[model samples]
Target: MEMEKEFEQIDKSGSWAAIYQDIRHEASDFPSRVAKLPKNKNRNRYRDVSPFDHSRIKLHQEDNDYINASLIKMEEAQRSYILTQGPLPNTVGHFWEMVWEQKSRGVVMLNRVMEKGSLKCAQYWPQKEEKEMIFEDTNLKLTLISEDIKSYYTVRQLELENLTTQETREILHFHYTTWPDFGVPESPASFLNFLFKVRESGSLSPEHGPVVVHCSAGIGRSGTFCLADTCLLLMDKRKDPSSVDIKKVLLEMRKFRMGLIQTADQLRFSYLAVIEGAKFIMGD
Candidate 1:
């Protein structure tokens, strides 16, 4: 009887995927994408990938050239900042690429702030002057490539150099070319470290700005990062969270970030990570 009821629940809730196994099997050595690979194969079907000359990678043609130019005019008064996708792409255009979900939802602005004197030191994966970030702001500064090679790899090396390479606190960036996972020790650990770095350097400071994190659509990968981060924030403010509705908080984050999760692993890990974060002191 319970088995019958289970089937009914799945039907009503449309969550059969949670009970299905073979259907969820990941792709083989080759990856699967929502869009079919182009017939030409060499044509630029996706954004520019890493280990390549990022300076020349189809940097978004829709660039607001006037804004980039005007920003330099106030060189004496304001600061400068740059945004990028990750170690996979070292170009600023790649970092700020906004993915729009056309189920009618318009674009979302993730660049929270781009102030002057906001960034200083500069470095790109290939050590190219064309890709290095330079700031015209004040003395107290920091340069955070949305996700840079050094920023990503250095953490992994540092953890290995020491003993903190725990299962939950490691760094893994083997492939920006493949799917992202929560079950993978290296990726999840790197995620925690990623959030920690963001919190320590930006979130806690007045010089805060939206950190651009992407895994393609600014959807699943980026969305989960943001959803978990903000959810952790809400959970922290639970002075009387007993009154807080789990459903409501989840909805709020989706309002701010679209496509929060596309897979069950994401949902499961988000729940676990949020619970784990609840134990930490807010603003710590």
Candidate 2:
């Protein structure tokens, strides 16, 4: 009864969202988004929850590479994620800088190219096939190797390098194309399949650098994806389906990135996705 009541309240009441919002509202107000530069400065256009200066990732150049991004490390779960806002037109270089410097193996994009007539992210990668993309600001170049398009998602093989060092690497780009800007996916099966695809590439492995996970603001859908992944991992490792505390895991993740799981509906969706995923893991 208690568990059922708890689950029942998720849809009607915004308990999870309220808790996240209140906790996130307590973060610092850093306004130097552009004291560094025009485009990079707006990396985090929002003033309420700026990345903590102490733990924020910075670049080696005189201009600085500070986007609205944070490095989240969960040692227990062996998960590290770079949660960031969608890149701005100017912040595209800084975006790649973070990726290159962090040695990330993959990028998980949870949003689309355009939303409601607004461009959510800069075309930081090659938009077409057989095209090369160069970011002059960072001397970085990205070439599209191949693309696999599914009904709900897209997988791309991209080659990235620093022109200055000529150190090249192949990066996996996973795009969840159909997830609504403010809505959850229609089913967990598809989401879990995509999650497993990334996992198979060893991108989320602790042996490598943190994986970059972003939606429009690096919250909401991104949060949902991280939460589901973490919970499922815990469930699988512990060999106890009910041992993982969903709310606690989410709170832990929130410490690294504010405003995760944006709405009450999104919170409810997280629980649904998690339960469905657990069933699959248990062979139900």
Candidate 3:
């Protein structure tokens, strides 16, 4: 039987466990309150207490959640399956590395960083479009989705044509600004709003195909977004998230892809994304 599915190469359990902290604050909003969290828990929350100062961006493979094969450094996917986590560092993206390419879909959605608290890489983000894409040093080139086979490619940037227009679509925004290291859930909320708004405008139709989100390295910003969607899928499966976790989903990513949220900074972003995505779904 030919089954249809969308894979999350980054998320785990019901939480957005696939991301790191570096880009979380960039993708989310300012904490509603300042409450002291655990050591290294540098982030603000709505609890109205202190704040989470989780300073010192965690490096990939340095944390408990930044799980990946220590030996494989190429950043390539093992199959044409779904990446519950995120796309490869956008220096250059690969679509043929995808394991399942028959009648399946791949969608990528991402956000632009914010100010005062967001991790704005000086020259990073897995999915960046420079005025010119160079091949070597940084794989910053327009990844050509094989045109010979006639694969459907739906690529669009983030933008809001209008606020009140029912026909307006939500395009991903890149708020490039640096801030103190802290978990920001609001940024992710803003991204979710973009998704909903795009869906509302009908411009970002599912027909846009499997989504592919990337920023600079792709893992920090895109990984968080990928993991959230992955966990949301597990919620749909009715299975215990812990049992069929995003790590499991990301296994494919680890085996097949590269630069998928490899550090604490990336993981932190994932955590922040969950913090925000849940709030958005719950109407917080």
Top candidate by TM-score: 2
Model 3 global lDDT (CA atoms, 0 to 1): 0.34
Over 1-284, each residue of candidate 1 has an lDDT whose tens digit, in order, gives: 22234435656796745633322342112222211234312222134221122111222334321111000011211221121232222233222221110010111122112213332111212223234333221111112323344433332111111112222111221212223222322244445555655565443223432233444333445555555565555545656433334334444443322234556555555555554555554444
Candidate 1: which stretches are off by over 4 Å?
A: 1-190, 203-206, 242-246, 282-284
**Model 1 TM-score relative to the real fold:** 0.42
For model 2, how many clashes? 1
Root-mean-square deviation of every model: 15.7, 3.2, 16.9
- Candidate 1 at 74: error in angstroms? 31
Instruction: Give the TM-score comparing model 3 with the true structure, all chains together.
Output: 0.36
Best-to-worst lDDT order: 2, 3, 1
Models ranked on TM-score: 2, 1, 3
Could you give candidate 2's per-residue lDDT for residues 116-198 as a string of tens digits? Answer: 89888887899776679889988999999999999988999999989999999999999988876556666677888888889
Ten-residue segment with the worst summed lDDT in candidate 2? 27-36
Give one digit per residue, the lDDT tens place, for model 3 in 26-136. Answer: 332323211233432222111232111221111122222111111211122212223322222431112212211212233343433433465432222224333323333
